[PDB]
């Protein structure tokens, strides 16, 4: 019943009837800035209920890249569409030019007083594995973490000068805590069966044996993920590429098992 603009970056736009389970509209913006060259990319569609207003800015050599997504639920609300002074200073880098990995970190000032310093780790087994800069993201005030058989996610978000500075986090520099949780991914009969679920050694602040059930992929394909998580993960959730996310957490080795 909701209707959204649906625009490809090429500027071909049309109205889109949202499917069931998509009851927000989104506008997504990418600015690619380099010396005296700007490229602006804009994309629009119907999107899932869980989306929020968010931004991320990071410098990567002589390049600056800025992402923003704005979402609303009223009806062709995305059909329309600041930038003055400098507020919180943050460390910035990014894995697309090896800048993070190589320690070539730079400083960036945020543009709204709402933005914070971000550090995000996305280890998958086309997103950058490491991003540092300015913005606001779901799970922000603070930090959150998850790891399992093929994944390490970490997000740190803070409001003091250059608080995202330091060496980049990698899973291997976090100690095994002694907690063990089951790991799996897929669905209850394919991927997450007692036959396919196994015990992994939890690391650093991740000591919750976690289970998220929801949907993934084009349609509402059902999906499920088990592993080791921070307390903070057990309270949105874009970190597992899922939608109607349902999280249980327990804090005993093995408790995570398909019961």
């Amino acid at each position, epitope marked *: 019943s909701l209707r959204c603009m649906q625009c490809k970056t090429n500027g071909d736009c049309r109205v889109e009837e949202c499917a069931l389970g998509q009851d927000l509209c989104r506008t997504t913006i990418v600015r690619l800035w380099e010396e005296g060259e700007e490229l602006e990319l804009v994309e629009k569609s119907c999107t899932h209920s869980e989306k929020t207003n968010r931004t991320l800015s990071y410098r990567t050599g002589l390049k600056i890249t800025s992402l923003t997504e704005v979402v609303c639920g009223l009806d062709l609300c995305n059909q329309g569409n600041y930038s003055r002074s400098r507020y919180l200073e943050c460390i910035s880098c990014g894995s697309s030019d090896m800048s993070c990995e190589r320690g070539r970190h730079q400083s960036l000032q945020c543009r709204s007083p709402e933005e914070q310093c971000l550090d995000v780790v996305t280890h998958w087994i086309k997103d950058d594995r490491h991003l540092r800069g300015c913005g606001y993201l779901p799970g922000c005030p603070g930090s959150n973490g998850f790891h399992n058989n093929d994944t390490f996610h970490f997000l740190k978000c803070c409001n003091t000068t250059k608080c995202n500075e330091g060496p980049i986090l990698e899973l*291997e*520099n*976090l*100690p*095994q*805590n*002694g*907690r063990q949780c089951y790991s799996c991914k897929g669905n209850s009969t394919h991927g997450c069966s007692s036959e396919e679920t196994f015990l992994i*050694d939890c690391r*650093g602040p991740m*000591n919750q044996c976690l289970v998220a059930t929801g949907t993934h992929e084009p349609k509402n394909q059902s999906y499920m993920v088990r592993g080791c998580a921070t*307390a903070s993960m057990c309270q949105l959730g874009d970190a597992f590429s899922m939608n109607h996310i349902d999280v249980s957490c327990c*804090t*005993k*080795s093995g408790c995570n098992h398909p019961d």
Partner: antibody
Amino acid sequence: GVKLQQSGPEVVKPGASVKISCKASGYSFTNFYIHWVKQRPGQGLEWIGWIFHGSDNTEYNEKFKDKATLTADTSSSTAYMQLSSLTSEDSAVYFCARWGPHWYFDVWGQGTTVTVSS
Amino acid sequence: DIVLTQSPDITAASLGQKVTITCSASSSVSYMHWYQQKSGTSPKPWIFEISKLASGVPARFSGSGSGTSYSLTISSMEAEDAAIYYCQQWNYPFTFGGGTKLEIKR
């Protein structure tokens, strides 16, 4: 500011139980692992276990699973360790220690002496 | 389950002598830390993450190693360095080596 205050020396009978305390100040208690460590007289250091956030989130040394129980009281930022069914082999100094930001035992309490005797 | 052997158990060192404590791990541990203890008082963090000095640790102290072998060096032995030193794996079993008692030779 940042410290771990342990409860006083204990004299207890064999077969009895003892519970000892570790009051944390000057930082956010529930964001950090508290570990417990045993040292018998003239001997080394044994890891007993940890607690994170509260009583439902613990890990033990297999050697102490039937001996130690770790609890926490968030309202007062205090960790506890109960030792049950005492013998003379449990006569030791017991330390609590924070697991710090760069993952070593960074702050220690002073120790509590447990003498088991009649 | 990772055994840590500390060698030697006891050494007496002259003032000015280079001292080396080694810690041996039956299997590979990414980070090893070192604690100093006097008079069965609280162990003091001394060297963390292999080679980093704790606040107030003097520059004559260093640490190094990897995998199954780590060392603590004191490049020139002083009287206040007499103590028991314990290595510890950074991770889960948090096992401590059995300790090296460092004394003054005379």
